[PDB]
Amino acid sequence: PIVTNAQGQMIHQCISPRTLNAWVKAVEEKAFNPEIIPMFMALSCGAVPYDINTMLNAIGGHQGALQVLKEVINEEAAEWDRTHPGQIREPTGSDIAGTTSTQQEQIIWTTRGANSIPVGDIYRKWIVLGLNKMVKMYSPVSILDIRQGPKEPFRDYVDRFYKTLRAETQEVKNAATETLLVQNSNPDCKQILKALGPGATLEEMMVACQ
Amino acid sequence: PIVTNAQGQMIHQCISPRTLNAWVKAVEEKAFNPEIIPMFMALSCGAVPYDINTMLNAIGGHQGALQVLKEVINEEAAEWDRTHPPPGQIREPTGSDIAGTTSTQQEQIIWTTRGANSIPVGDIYRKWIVLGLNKMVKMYSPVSILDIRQGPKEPFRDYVDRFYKTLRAETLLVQNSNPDCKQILKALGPGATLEEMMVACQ
Amino acid sequence: PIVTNAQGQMIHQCISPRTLNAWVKAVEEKAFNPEIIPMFMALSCGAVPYDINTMLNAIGGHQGALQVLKEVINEEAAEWDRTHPPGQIREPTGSDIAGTTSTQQEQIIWTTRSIPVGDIYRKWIVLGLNKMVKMYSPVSILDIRQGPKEPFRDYVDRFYKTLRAETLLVQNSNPDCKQILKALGPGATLEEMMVACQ
Amino acid sequence: PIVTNAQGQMIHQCISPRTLNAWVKAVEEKAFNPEIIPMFMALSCGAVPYDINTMLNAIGGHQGALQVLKEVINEEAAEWDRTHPIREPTGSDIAGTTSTQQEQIIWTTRSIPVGDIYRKWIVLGLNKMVKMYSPVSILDIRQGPKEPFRDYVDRFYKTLRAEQATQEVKNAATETLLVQNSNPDCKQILKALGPGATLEEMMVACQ
Amino acid sequence: PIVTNAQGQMIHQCISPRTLNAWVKAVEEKAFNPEIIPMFMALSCGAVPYDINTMLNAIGGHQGALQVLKEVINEEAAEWDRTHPPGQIREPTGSDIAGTTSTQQEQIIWTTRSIPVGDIYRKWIVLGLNKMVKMYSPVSILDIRQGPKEPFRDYVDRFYKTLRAETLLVQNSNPDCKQILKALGPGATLEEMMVACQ
Amino acid sequence: PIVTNAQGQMIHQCISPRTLNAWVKAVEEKAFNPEIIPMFMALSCGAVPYDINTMLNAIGGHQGALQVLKEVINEEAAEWDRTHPPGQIREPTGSDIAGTTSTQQEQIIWTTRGANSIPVGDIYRKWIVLGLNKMVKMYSPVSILDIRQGPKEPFRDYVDRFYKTLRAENAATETLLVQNSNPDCKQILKALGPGATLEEMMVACQ
């Protein structure tokens, strides 16, 4: 990340061994479940591209997934260059990816006074795009084929419903609640849920199926 | 959270990996047992809404539960906007600004640390989530206080813990005690403390 | 706890997640053995009643034990109210010291004005915890007798562990040691006893 | 690393016990898998050559590996002295063998980044070790008859990372083998997607 | 320990959960082997008697050992009162230094006026711990004899391990080394002895 | 170590529970393998002799090794006194640098004085590393001559045992490495000609 010294200058601070190991453990445990996105965003908070590359390269397995991320980064870096053909140069696509830029150069870009480019946040946005492709990828089933098992508790069916929905806005969710959640529930709950009338909250539904 | 830099300015500090894992492990282990409420309040203490959403979004399972929280948060945000109707300075925070959905890290700090009309969006948003979390504690409570009956050979100590654990999730203690203790408990006369009861059944 | 900001004002500081887990693990690991009393006192050091309630409420199990504590707290709060009947803070009631009817800020004003509401509430809880330590004590000190081939070292530790939860040491010692201990007369130090039985 | 004391002077900072043990555990756990390179670069971040030698010398096993590193360091030290005839730092000064902590700070804070240069040399030796402990060749990575393409892709790029470790400009032509060594059911699907399809498009079409 | 607030005054700082567990784990793991002495001095470094009693009281087992320590503390406290008989603070008694009749604040003023009551009380406890280290020493130095096929290096470690709890080294060595050791003449260092017995 | 208080004065700061346990665990796990030397220098960095003695005395086993160290410390302290015969501190003797006859405060004044600053902390660390090296060679069981590749041992593992033993005692002679390899590799290794790097050798025996 970036920090200010006693002198008031913007200097680089190395990513901590704790944060790096926390990221390694997260990818090993949480695979590419939807919660890997906020885990990445939290651990990469305030990081410059130099720090972020350390995180990605430190992952041991999942090398096919990391290859998908690196492909996505090249696409976004190319799109950047397309719209962006003793002072500091303007950052290229590879400069934002930290592959052709140094720690110090990345700090100058984020903290300069005129035309401040947050290269850290942009590169984080590129990686979230690749992670979203992987999160969508390890969830095969679509929200339409999420039907409550004959002897599945309604609590657990609701979690599979919204987990799958998460892998895919706030409003497109509300279209699935009143048309797919009630439709795909098992016959024991569909009778009870339709008996609560329209406009019932999700809380009122989960209690009525307990 | 918020911290002061070397110059004395109020700047954002990212939530620590320690705190984040402590909250993630807590939800994994404690489901929505009653003790999840004080854990959130302790771990999110001093957090801005940006930090708090990271905690909620880091949860892996319980996505149906989190949707109940999002309903409660929107309801409370509506109450805010209703009682807080809408160049150069920051805007006045809306309901969604306190929920951190339409406001940034910097804006949240400006609201909390400004000398004029300091609105603590972090504490307000924590209050909204505790309301949603309280709804979940009742929901994952399996047993009713009535089906907690002492086993024929169950120690009274362990029976008392299952009794008050169930009571926590949402004259009766003596009725549901096993036949051996019921004779002993009624023999202690009225007004006996829980200490006296646990000793007389050991 | 309480801290001073850059302006020099008394403000509330959140109990640390480390300290909270230390208390949670202590209750999980040390049950209600006698050493839970110093553990509570150390981990709740400098805490206002708001902080202490976070500690008690964070415990998952042991709810029967916590119910005994709240009975003790109500009794002590009543004793407070009995002896303590515009623009300034009210005088704290029993429940204000228990943090149930008082806020974080009110608790700081009381302590830093000069009524230490934090330490008083700790005294009430230690009183309740003492009742639980005696309660989970399985064996009575009278039924602590030295095994036939038990070393005097281990018997003494097992003896005083029981004594901690709530002339007899020499009586319940094995036959080999009682002769040696009675031959030293009464008033010999425990060092002299432990050396003479090794 | 280098830090400023209360007076504002550049003084040596002792490497922390946390960082040192993290590196010790990393070598114990990660052997010479490819991810040992980022571990070293992250844990040696901001380090002077004095600090870096403490990390290398703290390793318990793998003494044959360190001898490969020490050969590589001497090879790079010779190249340095050849192109570069306090004093001005020699090749051995960057390795921290003939220079002191204070001298290394003077060089870095003028400006020759002796810490970063010596890290660059050690990454060269560690890359040689990553390639060496790589068991399987990329040619013998073929998709199983009932192996899911997802799992085949991960074994493929695990192996591919291990042998392109010692390469400066990585050879992107080798990935074509992924389609060649894939099982007959997916090769039909992959040849049906034509060349230039992204790895995402391949992994979706084989699930 | 003692710290200075923003105003520059000496105020009490509570012992950290990290330090307290380090002390609890140490006594659990290292029993009363000789290395418990330096462990205590490091973990109780800078502590006032209030802090030190927290450490001792947090120990769960070893209650017979702690009972010997508390005996020694009273003896030293009596010796203090023996040699140390309005508006300002009283002069500290033996029990005041032991933290049994003195508060956190009183202890700090004494040290920060002087009298290092923390260091004195640590010194008294080291006396009791030394009595315990000698007491849990099982074997005497004479029954530490080099095995017939024991390497001299390993014999030396058992020799000085036992010797630490409370010219002989050469006597108790096996016949194979005694020939070599006596043949090196007197005044040879222990280093020289270990090379000649390898 | 030494730190500055709010007043700006040089005062002693107690060694951290983290560092001390790290040192205790290090000696328990790493015995007297060569890697014990870096652990000591890193964990004792910035320490005064008072702190360092706390580290040594906290070690539970290896009391014969510590007895060798105390001889070496006394030997080096004598060398100091031989070459180093009203209001401020005395000048430090050999035993003062070993922390046996000097206090915490005395050690700090010596290290932090502007004029004639004697770094008693670093000097005593040098004496102990000298003794610890003697123990590293001593727990080295085998001599470099009896390190021969097993009949079915992979050359990789033989190289590690070779240089581990060599580290315990700058000769820089690899003539034994090729000589003591098993007959299958010696044929291949001698066939690579002189001047081949260790990388090329380890690759050619895989």
Numbering used by the authors:
A (entry chain B): 1 to 85, 94 to 176, 179 to 220
B (entry chain C): 1 to 86, 93 to 176, 189 to 220
C (entry chain D), E (entry chain E): 1 to 85, 93 to 120, 124 to 176, 189 to 220
D (entry chain A): 1 to 85, 96 to 120, 124 to 220
F (entry chain F): 1 to 85, 93 to 176, 184 to 220
Task: Paste lines from the article.
HIV capsid has a pivotal role in regulating viral DNA synthesis and shielding viral DNA from cytosolic sensors. Previously reported X-ray structures of HIV-1(M) CA hexamers showed two distinct conformations with respect to a channel at the 6-fold symmetry axis. The beta hairpin structure (BHP) above the channel can assume ‘open’ (His12 forms a salt bridge with Asp51) or ‘closed positions’ (with a bridging water molecule between His12 and Asp51). Inside the channel, 6 positively charged arginines (R18) are hypothesized to mediate electrostatic nucleotide recruitment to fuel encapsidated DNA synthesis.
We solved the crystal structures of HIV-1(O) hexamers to 3 Å and found that unlike HIV-1(M), it exclusively adopted an ‘open’ channel conformation. Comparison of HIV-1(M) and HIV-1(O) hexamers explains the importance of position 50, which is conserved and located in the BHP hinge region (compare Fig. 4b–e). However, in HIV-1(O), Y50 has been retained from the ancestral SIVgor, preventing water coordination and BHP closure. However, comparison of the HIV-1(O) hexamer hinge region with that of the published HIV-2 CA N-terminal domain structure (PDB ID 2 × 82)47 and a modelled HIV-2 hexamer illustrates the similarity between these non-pandemic capsids, and suggests an ‘open’ BHP position for HIV-2. Inspection of hexamer structures from non-pandemic viruses revealed that the Arg lost from SIVcpzPtt/HIV-1(M) forms a salt bridge between helix 6 and the CypA binding loop in HIV-1(O) and HIV-2 CA helix 6 (Arg 120-Glu 98 in HIV-1(O), Arg 118-Glu 96 in HIV-2).
